[PDB]
Design brief:
part of a larger assembly; 2 chains; A: four-stranded mixed beta sheet; 47% helix; 11% strand; globular; B: mainly alpha; 57% helix; elongated; DNA polymerase epsilon catalytic subunit A (chain B); Cell division control protein 45 (chain A)
């Protein structure tokens, strides 16, 4: 372990001592864009440092190349660096060309001090042992995994470090085997950065309703792909909401009251900001459980609505103007008429925040709006950089959406979320009708070669959204065995693909012994190994490890070698 | 040689809209398609691997003005062109060219083809 849960306050105090000078701005926060959890964590840090008047700079970085370029550009005065959402799975001192002898001051006296401190803050579990164990400059905000599940790796790393006959060589190979089996592991996510920073705030005592709301947003960002993590962290948020809500309950509503509530939040898509029919129709879970992509699915949906006794005219009405008779009986109606179709998991408990008279909104809807703003908010090596520039710019739109004074931007985000879900649904029914997903014995490939609005999928977030749609659809099919999926999308302007190796997941709400063990995404190591040999102009720079940009002509040989690769 | 054999056969049988050459492609169509498939698989195996880039390199000549992404495609394009030179056998060579381009998953009338 490097920084446990109980000693986050030590890191915060170290940051304050090193860089809380009003003379200059010696603190720089590197945030990974295209990550809602990192966005909420950086918003928390921004508010916390605004309270203590610690001058700081927030830089959205898209890829590892940008991180390296910025660090090279980074001045030596800046003596505190925060990496939010990345950096925990690579040799940062090696990647950034860091040698501790050039950053050490006042070596003496069993202590050491350095002129610059890098605090990595992410949730991807393959901690690089040369970062968590063998470097003092790099300081990792651990969540308790290393101090409990890395004892063997700690011993193996230290023995090899200190040792630089037959028994000695045999034991070295035995220890080196322990390190090797630690690697060759898929990259998962166990915690949410927002929850970690909220734990730090609880240690410092700066918790309030806005920070709790940011924590809820960051945690709810994990419910789509890491539902086990969200279910693990949910009781803590539930306790915090009860702790922070004022005792003056059942009071009259006033234009100033902000209420965090735990009320039934059905697992539909933008239920409060769109019609009930559109909430069922465009839901990922409902689509998986009913197969609405085919023609018979719409008939099933209409039959369900008739069964509940909700007229289609009322069902398609906007949620605000739905008749108060139906809107107040949603719980009873869903209890009576959902287990018939297997949608019992739709009913759920979530967090809903109302700001005075501005109407309710749930964290699930809020994160969809934020994601939409990230995705569509606003010869070959140059236009791609223009895309990176636009993608960085969208981070600030999603950042400004968090402010309560910019609801006119959150509504635009909601509209963009509805449009993007519509486009995702159209492309999904186009893929599943033409049977574009080629089943294999290693990975179910799927390449998007032509169609409409194909420029949406050059963004990694939109491609992951489509992949999550497909994976949710496949997960509820019993015949289809679990298998990694690959999505690609040709970028005509740059003549390059965007391969996004995904991971399968068990059906939502299905809790078993094998469900408890998380599924690990093995595509990162496979991609890196394939790129190391057989130079193919592959661009592996995303913080999301399992996403690469490959030339149009080099895609097929790359996939051939990947098929020959048994790593994944 | 196939053209010569077809012309000899036509002359023996007898002794532009349609000349002596009308099925000269049938002599070597299948071997050519199989050879192209084998060459495509070999290329897909060795296109990216080093120690073979000395072979999959486009020569630089004074008249060079074309960017080549698939040298095998350039070879089949040249062969199909020299076969399409004949006016009488346009159709039977267009069919062969379409079959050859199906290997590359390229449309018959694609601009690159």
């Amino acid at each position: 372990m490097y920084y446990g849960i109980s000693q986050f306050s030590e890191a915060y105090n170290k940051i304050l001592r090193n860089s809380s000078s009003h003379s200059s701005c010696q603190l720089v926060i590197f945030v990974s864009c295209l990550n809602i959890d990192a966005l909420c964590a950086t918003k928390m840090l921004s508010l916390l440092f605004k309270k203590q008047l610690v001058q700081s700079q927030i830089v959205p970085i898209f890829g590892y190349s940008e991180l390296r370029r910025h660090y090279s550009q980074l001045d030596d005065n800046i003596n505190s660096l925060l990496l939010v959402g990345f950096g925990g799975v690579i040799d940062l001192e090696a990647f950034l060309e860091i040698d501790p002898q050039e950053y050490v001051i006042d070596t003496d006296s069993g202590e050491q001090s350095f002129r610059r401190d890098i605090y990595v803050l992410d949730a991807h579990r393959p901690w690089n042992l040369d970062n968590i164990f063998g470097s003092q400059i790099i300081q990792c905000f651990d969540d308790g995994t290393v101090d409990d599940t890395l004892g063997e790796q700690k011993e193996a790393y230290y023995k090899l470090l200190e040792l630089d006959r037959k028994q000695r060589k045999k034991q070295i190979h035995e220890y080196e085997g322990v390190l090797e089996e630690y690697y060759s592991q898929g990259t998962t996510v166990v915690n949410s950065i927002s929850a970690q920073i909220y734990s730090l705030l609880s240690a410092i005592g700066e918790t309030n309703l806005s920070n709790l709301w940011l924590n809820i947003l960051g945690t709810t960002s994990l419910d789509i792909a890491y539902a086990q993590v969200y279910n693990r962290l949910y009781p803590l948020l539930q306790d915090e909401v009860k702790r922070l809500t004022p005792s003056s309950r059942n009071s009259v509503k006033t234009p100033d009251t902000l209420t965090l509530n735990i009320q039934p939040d059905y697992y539909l898509f933008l239920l409060r900001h769109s019609s009930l029919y559109d909430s069922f129709y465009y839901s990922n879970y409902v689509n998986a459980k009913l197969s609405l992509w085919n023609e018979n699915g719409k008939k099933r949906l209409h039959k369900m609505f008739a069964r509940m006794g909700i007229p289609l005219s009322t069902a398609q009405e906007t949620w605000l103007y739905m008749d108060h008779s139906i809107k107040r009986e949603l719980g009873i109606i869903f209890d009576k008429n959902l287990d018939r179709y297997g949608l019992q998991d739709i009913i759920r408990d979530g967090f809903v925040r109302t700001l005075g008279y501005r109407g309710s909104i749930s964290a699930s809807e809020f994160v969809e709006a934020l994601t939409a703003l990230l995705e569509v908010g606003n010869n070959s090596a140059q236009k791609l950089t223009n895309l990176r520039k636009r993608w960085v710019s969208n981070f600030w739109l999603s950042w400004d959406a968090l402010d309560d004074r910019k609801v006119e931007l959150l509504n635009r985000g909601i509209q963009l979320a509805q449009d993007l879900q519509r486009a995702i649904f159209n492309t999904g029914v186009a893929i599943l009708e033409k049977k574009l997903i080629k089943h294999l014995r290693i990975y179910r490939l799927c390449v998007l070669q032509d169609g409409p609005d194909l420029d949406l999928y050059r963004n990694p977030l939109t491609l992951l959204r489509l992949g999550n749609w497909l994976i949710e659809c496949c997960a509820e099919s019993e015949d289809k065995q679990l298998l990694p999926m690959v999505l690609a999308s040709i970028d005509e302007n740059t003549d390059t693909y965007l391969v996004a190796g995904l991971t399968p997941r068990y059906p939502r709400g299905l809790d078993t012994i094998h469900t408890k063990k998380p599924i690990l995404n093995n595509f990162s190591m496979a991609f890196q190994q394939i790129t190391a040999e057989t130079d193919a102009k592959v661009r592996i720079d995303n913080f999301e490890s399992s996403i690469i940009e490959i030339r149009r002509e080099d895609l097929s040989p790359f996939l051939e070698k990947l098929t020959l690769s048994g790593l994944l | 040689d196939s053209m010569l054999k077809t012309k000899q056969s036509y002359l023996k049988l007898n002794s532009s809209v349609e000349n002596s050459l009308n099925g000269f492609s049938h002599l070597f169509s299948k071997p050519l398609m199989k050879r192209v498939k084998k060459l495509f698989k070999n290329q897909q195996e060795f296109i990216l691997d080093p120690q073979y880039e000395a072979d999959y390199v486009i020569p630089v000549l004074p008249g060079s003005h074309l960017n080549v992404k698939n040298p095998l495609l350039e070879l089949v394009k040249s062969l199909c062109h020299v076969m399409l030179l004949s006016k009488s056998t346009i159709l039977e060579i267009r069919t062969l060219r379409k079959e050859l381009l199906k290997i590359f998953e390229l449309r018959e009338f694609a601009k690159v083809a």
